[PDB]
Design a protein around this ligand. Structure first.
Ligand SMILES: C[N+](C)(CCCS(=O)(=O)[O-])Cc1ccccc1
Ligand SMILES: [Zn+2]
Length: 87
C-alpha cells in the first residue's frame, strides 16, 4: 500500500515530465518506476501480465529490439495505469 502509493506518484510524475518534453527526466523516473515494479511484482491475472510484459520489455531492450521496446512500454504503461488506477 505504501509501495502502491509510491508507484502512483511516479506514474503521475512521468506524465508531467512527458507533457513538459523532459525526456531525461522521463528516463530517470522510469528507472525509479522499474525499481518499484521489480519489488512490488517480484496474484491477479493483470498483476501476472504486468510481470510478464515487464520482463519481456527488458529482454527486448537487452536484445536491441527497439520497435518492440516502444510497443511494450506503451502497453506496460496502460496496464500499470489500470492496475494502480492512475489517470
Ligand atoms: C494484448 N497484447 C498482449 C498484444 C496481443 C498480441 S497483438 O499485439 O498482435 O494484438 C498487448 C501487447 C503486449 C506487448 C506488446 C504490445 C502489445
Ligand atoms: Zn523495469
Amino acid at each position: 500500500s505504501p509501495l502502491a502509493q509510491q508507484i502512483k506518484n511516479i506514474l503521475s510524475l512521468i506524465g508531467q515530465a512527458d507533457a513538459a518534453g523532459r525526456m531525461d527526466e522521463v528516463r530517470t523516473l522510469q528507472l525509479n518506476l522499474c525499481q518499484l515494479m521489480v519489488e512490488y511484482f517480484q496474484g491477479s491475472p493483470l498483476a501476472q501480465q504486468i510481470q510478464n510484459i515487464h520482463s519481456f520489455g527488458h529482454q527486448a531492450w537487452a536484445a536491441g529490439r527497439l520497435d518492440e521496446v516502444r510497443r511494450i512500454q506503451e502497453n506496460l504503461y496502460q496496464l500499470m495505469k489500470e492496475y494502480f488506477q492512475q489517470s
